[PDB]
Design an enzyme around this catalytic site. Sequence first.
Site, PDB file in Angstrom:
ATOM      1  N   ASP B  21     -39.824   7.604  -2.298  1.00  8.71           N
ATOM      2  CA  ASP B  21     -40.155   7.928  -3.719  1.00  8.71           C
ATOM      3  C   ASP B  21     -40.368   6.713  -4.637  1.00  8.71           C
ATOM      4  OD1 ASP B  21     -38.091   9.476  -2.666  1.00  8.71           O
ATOM      5  OD2 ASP B  21     -37.349   9.849  -4.724  1.00  8.71           O
ATOM      6  N   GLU B 170     -21.371  14.040  23.398  1.00  5.64           N
ATOM      7  CA  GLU B 170     -21.360  15.553  23.813  1.00  5.64           C
ATOM      8  C   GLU B 170     -21.945  16.420  22.613  1.00  5.64           C
ATOM      9  OE1 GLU B 170     -18.537  13.203  23.974  1.00  5.64           O
ATOM     10  OE2 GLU B 170     -17.803  13.514  25.828  1.00  5.64           O
ATOM     11  N   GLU B 198     -15.235   0.354   3.848  1.00  7.31           N
ATOM     12  CA  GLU B 198     -15.802  -1.095   3.790  1.00  7.31           C
ATOM     13  C   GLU B 198     -17.006  -0.933   4.573  1.00  7.31           C
ATOM     14  OE1 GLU B 198     -14.769  -3.102   0.904  1.00  7.31           O
ATOM     15  OE2 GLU B 198     -13.383  -1.289   0.593  1.00  7.31           O
ATOM     16  N   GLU B 200     -18.298  -3.512   6.611  1.00  6.65           N
ATOM     17  CA  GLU B 200     -17.915  -4.884   7.259  1.00  6.65           C
ATOM     18  C   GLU B 200     -19.063  -5.107   8.307  1.00  6.65           C
ATOM     19  OE1 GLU B 200     -14.111  -6.063   8.243  1.00  6.65           O
ATOM     20  OE2 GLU B 200     -13.235  -4.704   6.396  1.00  6.65           O
TER      21      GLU B 200
END
Lengths: 324, 309, 309, 17, 17, 20
Positions: B21, B170, B198, B200
């Site tokens: 948008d 699965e 976090e 990382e």
Amino acid sequence: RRRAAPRQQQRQQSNRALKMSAPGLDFLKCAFASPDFSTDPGKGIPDKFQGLVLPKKHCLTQSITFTPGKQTMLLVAPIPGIACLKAEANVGASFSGVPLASVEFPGFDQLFGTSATDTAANVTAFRYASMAAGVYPTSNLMQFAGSIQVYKIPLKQVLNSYSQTVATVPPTNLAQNTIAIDGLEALDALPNNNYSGSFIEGCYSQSVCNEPEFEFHPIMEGYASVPPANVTNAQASMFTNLTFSGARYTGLGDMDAIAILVTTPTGAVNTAVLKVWACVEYRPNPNSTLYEFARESPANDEYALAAYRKIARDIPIAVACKDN
Amino acid sequence: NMLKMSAPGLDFLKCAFASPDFSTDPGKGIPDKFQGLVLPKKHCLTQSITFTPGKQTMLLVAPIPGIACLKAEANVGASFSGVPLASVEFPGFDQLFGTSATDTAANVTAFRYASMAAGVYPTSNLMQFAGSIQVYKIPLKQVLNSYSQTVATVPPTNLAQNTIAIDGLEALDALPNNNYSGSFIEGCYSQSVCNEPEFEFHPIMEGYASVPPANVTNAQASMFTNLTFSGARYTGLGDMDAIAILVTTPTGAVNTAVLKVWACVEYRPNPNSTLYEFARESPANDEYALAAYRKIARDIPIAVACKDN
Amino acid sequence: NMLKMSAPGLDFLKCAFASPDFSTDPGKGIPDKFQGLVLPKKHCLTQSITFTPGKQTMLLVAPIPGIACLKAEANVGASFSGVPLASVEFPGFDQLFGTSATDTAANVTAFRYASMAAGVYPTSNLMQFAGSIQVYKIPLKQVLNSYSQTVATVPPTNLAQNTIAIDGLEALDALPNNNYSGSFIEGCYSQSVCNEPEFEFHPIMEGYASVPPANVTNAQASMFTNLTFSGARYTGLGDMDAIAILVTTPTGAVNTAVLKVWACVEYRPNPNSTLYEFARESPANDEYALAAYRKIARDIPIAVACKDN
Amino acid sequence: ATFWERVRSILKSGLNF
Amino acid sequence: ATFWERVRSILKSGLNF
Amino acid sequence: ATFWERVRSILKSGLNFAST
């Protein structure tokens, strides 16, 4: 009254019928005072992550009988399905070659399944919120003898290297890897951070997160023993090995293992009831039955996490039964 | 009225949730603690898809660096068990990860995901569409699974082997209650959020032509189905939950659309590549952007129809 | 005083950036939200180096536990491709990690880097030297790369194997826009900063006497040169960018100096070690200390002359 | 309404922190 | 007495500083 | 010009900015 007497000197176990977020407070109650609570799994960890999680509270109530003339190790390690690992060694001996066998929490096969070849079927990742254990003696005051000592081992999982020469026309050397666990030598140690006490006053100890942040670990498949099948401790560059029989090594969490060394001398009748508590946040697979019971991890409560670190610092290494 | 966020922090929110948008995806990395040199690439696959009638087609939008999504077809109601998930790459793979998987970490050393989104824009008319679009999310995670292999020697020797595998495939066969199920002609639009506390950095893997690496059995890897990357190679898995889009088209229906996949990834540039000159620092920590990130994450529906993107 | 920088937090700043400016490194650990028992070692190698005339010598200061840096030489203008980088160990390796690296995790089981700095203090005559010192930083990351090995069995069995390897080594041949170029006579001074949002701990690896492990081809590991640790062994890679110091010395030029490398590492003591008795608690979280860290780190130069250290 | 307009309302509604 | 009561007095003595 | 004085001038310049 016949029983007001040696009743209480052997601990009781269960009786049934400040600005923090509730889940942040619950997190604290679970982390440090699990026995004082028979409640549902405290929402989880009041930390940043707010995704679908299955807060599960694992509890093991099991009577143990310690053999005379031997020190028995009850290693409470943060491995998903397993409660603790046990081993025995002659009083002066070292748990060097001594295999540590698993004692699983109830309902392992419904969560992880029969074979490791299908453990990450229902749950793909985990994270540890708490881990606590207590040894409640049920021996009489005229026959027990010995000591319970507790300390913590900072064992972390590594990918070690070894070279294996395969026989062929001209033999070949393969550069091989193996998953192993560091710091197992600590089984023979009695750090300057230990609780030494009589056997009659079993212990109560809990460990806390040994990492700056509570991160998710994947659930390992195919591992039936720590140094996996066909690898020798020596190849895996590790002290002793960990064996799981009806279970499998699922992974290692971010907590320090609570090592309880109960040492029963010759001729002593030392029996007790071991209780282990552990709240693990698991990421549910849409394919499982318990996915329906999954709820979002509680919202970050920086104050709860702040108290967690302080309370954890002034707390004793381990305490006697009565003070849990 | 009261948005006290750093511009880049706010921009980070536009990037993660409302990608389509704006004039340009505001596009600035994760406004978190790490402030090192980063090369933020805003990937986008705009493709015209024609769904094969008589089958369900899975479009697994997973956080794998160069690849947009993994696609696989199965008869309606069948299971994608042995069904391999083929890579549908984001444009310009060879220009970032090279041709072979042996020069993959040439320009980029590590990665980390800032956003992931997908949208199906139906282009069939009211006299030819038929079918459904269902969306749910799977928590894929990478693992080092174990298996023993027997090598045929004088006495056959048993080896202890490993495989980089992916957990959770699965779920590729089970529609959870947390799902969006709608008619085909109201294409979906969903975006996933971070899998952890976090953001990382992850190293860029090399030599991976398929998830269960070449020469490993789907079963040895303890996996459900395998992921195949032809040309493109498996670089790693990010920290986003995979967005699973399942389009079921009956025989005789013409379900056509415009598939779109978005993904802003922060890469650690290799001092050796020419791209290093486009690298800039990560935005500074904005606890407000990161706090809003998670509330908006919670109050957000799994998927919406095109119109609400 | 409501909220100021905790002393250890302030000391963390001195430790990280201005290591040699004080009587003793005020490294009281990392004001990180982990308050567990740690054993901080303030490593420092002081060594007299004499640079070989007619060659560029690469002193790669990487965050590997017991090793100070990796040294390699190549003709001026030549590529450090096949060229292996040899370890220059921090003093006292055998004491911490052990003789054979199968003991390596006996005193310490995990590590995490706080500081890393290097300095070249030229001791040449003013009419003796010639050359330049250049410093840039490489973002190396550890990875598990795949490769297939065909074993000479009757029907030759191919094995799908893996090896641990380090990414971004190609940068050894690069001079990025973020470099420090200067005369040799004014050596350098440079420090590194954590390249991740959080300071996570890392296990101590055993059995690695070289990055591409023994018996793995450089090309199988998919890396460009190899790291060889003789005596000492590869223990792991910390979360910091390798400081790349390139001293290019002409023919006839006598470039001698004193190489100094600093590194305060927080290690997790093994309860079975005698060293777990010097161990102390990591300092308490100091959001302001960490805030300044990330800022200061953004405003300082890549490297400085050895006079403004 | 576009996804941004709804992201907005969530922000407008409240964040304690 | 119980670890919970004990936890509280630590938390309650004044966690902030 | 010790690197510390350099560092000092930086946070003295105005690290006050923010933290939470």
